[PDB]
Each structure stands twice: as C-alpha cells, then as structure tokens.
Design an enzyme around this catalytic site. Sequence first.
Site, PDB file in Angstrom:
ATOM      1  N   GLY A  62      -2.301   7.466   4.254  1.00  0.00           N
ATOM      2  CA  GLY A  62      -1.279   8.065   3.404  1.00  0.00           C
ATOM      3  C   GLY A  62      -0.304   8.858   4.186  1.00  0.00           C
ATOM      4  O   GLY A  62       0.767   9.099   3.673  1.00  0.00           O
ATOM      5  N   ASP A 115       0.879  -1.216   0.000  1.00  0.00           N
ATOM      6  CA  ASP A 115       0.000   0.000   0.000  1.00  0.00           C
ATOM      7  C   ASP A 115       0.912   1.263   0.000  1.00  0.00           C
ATOM      8  O   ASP A 115       1.042   1.934   1.008  1.00  0.00           O
ATOM      9  CB  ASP A 115      -0.892  -0.013   1.262  1.00  0.00           C
ATOM     10  CG  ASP A 115      -2.007   1.045   1.184  1.00  0.00           C
ATOM     11  OD1 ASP A 115      -2.204   1.668   0.143  1.00  0.00           O
ATOM     12  OD2 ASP A 115      -2.691   1.246   2.172  1.00  0.00           O
TER      13      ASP A 115
END
Length: 223
Positions: free
Chosen positions: A178, A84
């Site tokens: 993120g 990811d």
Amino acid sequence: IVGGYTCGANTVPYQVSLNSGYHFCGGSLINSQWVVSAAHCYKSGIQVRLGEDNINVVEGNEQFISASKSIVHPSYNSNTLNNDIMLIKLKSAASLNSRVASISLPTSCASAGTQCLISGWGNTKSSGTSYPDVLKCLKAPILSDSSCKSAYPGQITSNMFCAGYLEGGKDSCQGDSGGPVVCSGKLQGIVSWGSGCAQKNKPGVYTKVCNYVSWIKQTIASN
Ligand SMILES: NC(=[NH2+])c1ccc2[nH]c(-c3cc(OC(F)(F)F)ccc3[O-])nc2c1
Ligand SMILES: [Ca+2]
C-alpha cells in the site's frame, strides 16, 4: 523494507500508516482528505495515521483520522492482484504543513532506470519477521519490462512494473504493502507483491499509478 535505511522523522511527509489496532499497510496522502493504498489492504475499521515516524510511541506531529469509506478498484482481481489500488476518504481533512503533506500524481509514466524512493514499516528480514518502530527508506530503480516479465513470466499485466535489485538484499516486504514508490516527486507506484523479500532475481512488483490517474480524479470528484 529489507536493506533500507532509517528515513529520519517526517522526511517522507506523504507516508501514512493504516492501523486497525496495529500497523498493517502503508498508504500515500494525495490531498487533505484522500489517501491511495493497495486494494489488498482493504478491511473495515481503518484509522489512518499521518505524521508518524515511530508507530509505537506518540512523539508529536501525529494526526489519527478514521477512514469514512474505502473504494477498491471495481476490476481488482485478488488472484492476480491486477488493479491493486484503493482510495480511502478521511472522516475529516488532515492539517497539511511540512510534516504532513500530499504527494502529486504523475502526468506521465516513468521509464526503466528511473530511481525512486520506497518507504514503510514492513519487515526488514527476507527470511523471518523483524518489523521496525521507525520508518525505513530504500532508493530502487524501475526495471525494464523484459527483466520484469522474465522474472515473473505470465504474471505481469500492463498495470504493474518491477523495481528493485535482481542481485537481492534490498526490497520492500510484508507491512510495506500500500505504500509509495515516488520518483522525481511524483507517486508512480504502490507496493503490491513480490516472491518472498529481497530474493535474487525476484524484484518487487508495484501498481503502475500513471494508468489510474483519470480514475482517481473522476472517483474523488464524485465522492
Ligand atoms: N517482495 C516484495 N517486494 C513484497 C512487497 C509487498 C508484499 N506484501 C506481501 C504480503 C504478504 C502476505 O502474506 C503473509 F501474511 F503470509 F506474509 C500478506 C500481505 C502482504 O502484503 N509480500 C510482499 C512482498
Ligand atoms: Ca509515533
């Protein structure tokens, strides 16, 4: 961030807000033209906002730059969130100074017990949504692999690590995805997923950045 504190304007100078008409994910500035975030934050129409503190007010120090391209890891799996990680190249380079600065990539992985700083504009409630205007911070330790694997059996790959509090109350949450997990001044993780937010025995799971440093360097070098 649930159970965190107000960081203070520009105290986390590498933190970026990914905006598509509203803040949807965080990211980390690693050089004047590149940002690292999570592959699950990918979308087109991304504007990277640097030097931010209150995301709803322009107060000075902000630099808004459009993303020229986003490179999601080729082996990213959206069902397991393995790999990811995503790199975003900026249309123009950012002006670095003390309010906007890049963070260094690690030379080695961090061990359990390492204390790290996680930050973001994500939800501050574990039950319900409350998104802040200013940047929140949280200091959390990296957990051992056995505690991580015991918390999420069969869902942890070697590209993930857990950090947080098993007693609950303090954790990253939706909106923080993120963003950075910085330990000893090095970017060691990216906020990736978790079951709910700040729930007992369900710590946050982060992308293990030390496993992607060669990939990050090779990709930036060829783009
Ligand atoms: N507990 C945690 N440490 C955590 C961290 C990042 C997360 N990001 C998300 C997340 C949840 C989403 O689902 C929703 F829109 F239904 F709430 C979507 C994107 C996310 O990044 N949950 C998260 C949980
Ligand atoms: Ca602002």
